[PDB]
Amino acid sequence: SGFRKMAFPSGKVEGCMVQVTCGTTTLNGLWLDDVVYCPRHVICTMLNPNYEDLLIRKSNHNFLVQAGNVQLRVIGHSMQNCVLKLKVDTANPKTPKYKFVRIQPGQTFSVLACYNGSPSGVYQCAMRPNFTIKGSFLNGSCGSVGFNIDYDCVSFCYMHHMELPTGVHAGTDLEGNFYGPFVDRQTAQAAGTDTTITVNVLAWLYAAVINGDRWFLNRFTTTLNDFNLVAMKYNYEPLTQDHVDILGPLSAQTGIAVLDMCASLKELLQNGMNGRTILGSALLEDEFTPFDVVRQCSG
Amino acid sequence: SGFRKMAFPSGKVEGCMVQVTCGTTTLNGLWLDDVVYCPRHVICTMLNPNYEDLLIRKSNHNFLVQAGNVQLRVIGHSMQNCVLKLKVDTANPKTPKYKFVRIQPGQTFSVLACYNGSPSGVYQCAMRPNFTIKGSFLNGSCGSVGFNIDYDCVSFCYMHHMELPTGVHAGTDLEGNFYGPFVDRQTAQAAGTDTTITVNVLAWLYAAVINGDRWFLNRFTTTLNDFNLVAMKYNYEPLTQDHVDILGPLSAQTGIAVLDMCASLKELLQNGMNGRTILGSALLEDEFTPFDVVRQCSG
Numbered sequence: 001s002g003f004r005k006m007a008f009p010s011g012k013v014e015g016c017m018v019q020v021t022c023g024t025t026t027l028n029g030l031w032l033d034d035v036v037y038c039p040r041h042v043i044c045t046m047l048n049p050n051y052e053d054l055l056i057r058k059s060n061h062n063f064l065v066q067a068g069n070v071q072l073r074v075i076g077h078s079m080q081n082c083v084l085k086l087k088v089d090t091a092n093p094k095t096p097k098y099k100f101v102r103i104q105p106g107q108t109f110s111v112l113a114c115y116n117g118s119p120s121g122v123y124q125c126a127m128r129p130n131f132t133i134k135g136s137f138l139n140g141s142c143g144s145v146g147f148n149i150d151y152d153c154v155s156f157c158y159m160h161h162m163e164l165p166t167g168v169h170a171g172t173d174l175e176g177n178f179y180g181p182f183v184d185r186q187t188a189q190a191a192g193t194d195t196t197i198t199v200n201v202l203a204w205l206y207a208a209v210i211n212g213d214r215w216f217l218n219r220f221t222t223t224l225n226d227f228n229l230v231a232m233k234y235n236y237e238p239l240t241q242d243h244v245d246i247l248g249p250l251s252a253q254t255g256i257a258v259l260d261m262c263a264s265l266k267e268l269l270q271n272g273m274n275g276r277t278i279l280g281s282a283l284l285e286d287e288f289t290p291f292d293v294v295r296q297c298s299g
Numbered sequence: 300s301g302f303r304k305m306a307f308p309s310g311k312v313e314g315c316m317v318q319v320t321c322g323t324t325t326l327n328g329l330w331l332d333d334v335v336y337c338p339r340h341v342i343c344t345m346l347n348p349n350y351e352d353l354l355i356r357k358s359n360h361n362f363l364v365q366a367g368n369v370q371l372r373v374i375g376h377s378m379q380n381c382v383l384k385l386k387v388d389t390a391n392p393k394t395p396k397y398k399f400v401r402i403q404p405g406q407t408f409s410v411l412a413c414y415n416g417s418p419s420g421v422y423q424c425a426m427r428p429n430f431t432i433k434g435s436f437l438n439g440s441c442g443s444v445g446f447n448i449d450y451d452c453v454s455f456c457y458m459h460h461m462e463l464p465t466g467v468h469a470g471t472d473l474e475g476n477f478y479g480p481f482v483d484r485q486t487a488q489a490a491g492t493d494t495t496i497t498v499n500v501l502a503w504l505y506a507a508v509i510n511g512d513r514w515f516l517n518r519f520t521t522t523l524n525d526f527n528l529v530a531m532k533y534n535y536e537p538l539t540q541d542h543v544d545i546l547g548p549l550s551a552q553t554g555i556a557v558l559d560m561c562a563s564l565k566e567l568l569q570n571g572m573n574g575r576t577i578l579g580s581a582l583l584e585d586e587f588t589p590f591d592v593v594r595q596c597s598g
């Protein structure tokens with residue numbers, strides 16, 4: 001038992017992290033096969049850059065890629081959206097089985113924070129409904145990646161590009177498309193107002209039941225439609241029938257109907273917690289997906 | 300910016316995890332050089348075991364060690380306190396630079412949860428003042444290890460042995476000595492009443508200041524002695540002058556005197572938070588050490 005903010009083991013991604021240097025700028029890159037992926041803003045000095053221009057003025061030799069202690073020779077460079085791809089002469093022998101995936105808001109992933117191509121730490125986060133992530137990133141972290149692992153396949157879903165003025169974080173999928181409306185320019189950009197991920201909050205309530213916190217349960221039930229009326233009021237995402245279906249296995253294992261759990265959340269939203277806690281939290285946690293809960297509570 | 304429950308990258312430990320099988324029991328082992336370390340209760344079937352007896356009745360062939368897909372041949376076995384050491388014919392080529400350390404309560408470490416010798420997830424935790432840890436562990440997790448990484452040296456500090464009836468967790472250092480009063484027997488054992496780690500709470504308050512949460516600061520100061528009187532009342536560990544000194548660099552970087560921050564904690568203990576949060580928490584977090592904060596906030 002127990003329930004922790006748990007990341008995937010990071011080894012398979014550690015073996016892919018490199019340092020990419022272009023002029024005075026250093027940041028991190030992802031070395032898979034004979035290709036190195038990094039934020040294209042590594043070629044900037046960029047209040048309003050034209051990256052087609054900045055890249056036409058570069059040659060392979062303007063890029064220094066360092067893997068461990070060995071320099072890798074760049075033998076070609078290109079742009080795919082907001083990611084720079086650097087072809088190298090040597091194919092990373094530690095390349096895992098992998099895929100690139102573009103995740104939906106509300107999905108979670110592990111982040112391997114890296115500096116100068118050296119991994120620093122690993123943590124879990126979620127793609128917020130407003131397409132930011134609440135990460136932990138210092139200067140030099142751009143190019144650090146987010147990922148999930150399934151069996152032995154690393155699904156890369158995030159590459160870090162920018163910290164916004166609010167201290168939240170924005171980046172791309174590994175094909176270089178930003179999550180959300182953001183662009184890689186040093187210009188005024190605000191995220192939409194964020195909302196709480198309802199289906200995850202419910203999954204975490206089921207995790208709490210699986211671990212013996214029950215003080216919030218009740219005999220009541222609600223209709224999907226009546227619950228959503230409360231959710232909107234408290235800036236929660238609407239719950240869909242597909243969410244209800246995805247919560248199926250947990251509802252079964254705990255014998256608690258999804259719409260029964262929705263009645264608990266209603267009370268907690270209305271009456272707060274009154275000084276008690278759930279899985280060691282004094283507020284409602286929304287960065288565990290239903291599949292995260294099942295993974296960690298029952299393997 | 301941002302502040303997360305951050306673990307060390309787990310790759311160097313992943314390359315050491317094996318499966319150890321003795322009879323009907325399977326659990327995890329740590330393969331370093333030509334030696335495999337695992338809980339000695341792998342040889343039990345143990346309401347009151349005599350491990351000297353149970354081990355004299357075993358031969359090398361009673362132990363199956365599986366690393367990846369290859370079986371490793373056991374060429375010798377011994378007991379050191381509560382850890383079984385299995386000498387193997389082949390020295391793990393992925394052995395990192397490493398040391399065994401016995402940590403003090405209040406120190407944090409990363410945990411690599413493993414099942415059948417396969418890493419499952421990584422998370423941070425702390426050694427509680429009562430020498431338990433609040434981990435996340437399912438059946439089969441025994442032998443999973445906790446560790447810190449310094450430069451490139453893995454300091455192993457924990458091996459998982461038991462879940463207590465309260466759902467908290469007990470284990471040993473890597474030389475097999477339990478933290479706390481626990482013994483590896485299926486018998487009534489309760490942990491001491493736990494307390495909150497004051498110096499860590501203060502470190503986390505400094506992290507919050509470094510990230511722009513300041514609503515809890517005040518103009519007041521307190522004496523070390525007066526603060527401890529409040530701490531005792533709220534089941535906080537006494538703060539020592541050595542704690543004050545360890546908080547030195549943070550106090551400086553933020554320009555906030557340790558004893559000034561102690562005045563804030565007093566208020567928060569007395570008046571609670573009144574519906575506001577700190578680093579995304581509605582309660583006082585005590586599983587970040589002063590060195591964790593410095594690592595993550597300023598590298």
Ligand SMILES: COCCOc1cc(Cl)cc(-c2cc(-c3ccccc3C#N)cn(-c3cccnc3)c2=O)c1
Nearest residue numbers: 027041137138139140141142162163164184185186189
């Ligand atoms: C729209 O919102 C405002 C932010 O505008 C941008 C836009 C663009 Cl194109 C990029 C950036 C940005 C750049 C660099 C950088 C700069 C020079 C050398 C190395 C690095 C690294 N590495 C670093 N960071 C950063 C800092 C701390 C945490 N995370 C990310 C950044 O955000 C910020």
Ligand SMILES: COCCOc1cc(Cl)cc(-c2cc(-c3ccccc3C#N)cn(-c3cccnc3)c2=O)c1
Nearest residue numbers: 326340436437438439440441461462463483484485488
């Ligand atoms: C004093 O407190 C009560 C617990 O008494 C003990 C004492 C002793 Cl010697 C051991 C245990 C114990 C054993 C086994 C086990 C048993 C058989 C086969 C494989 C495994 C694994 N692996 C598993 N676990 C466990 C379960 C879930 C989370 N963490 C640990 C355990 O605690 C529990």
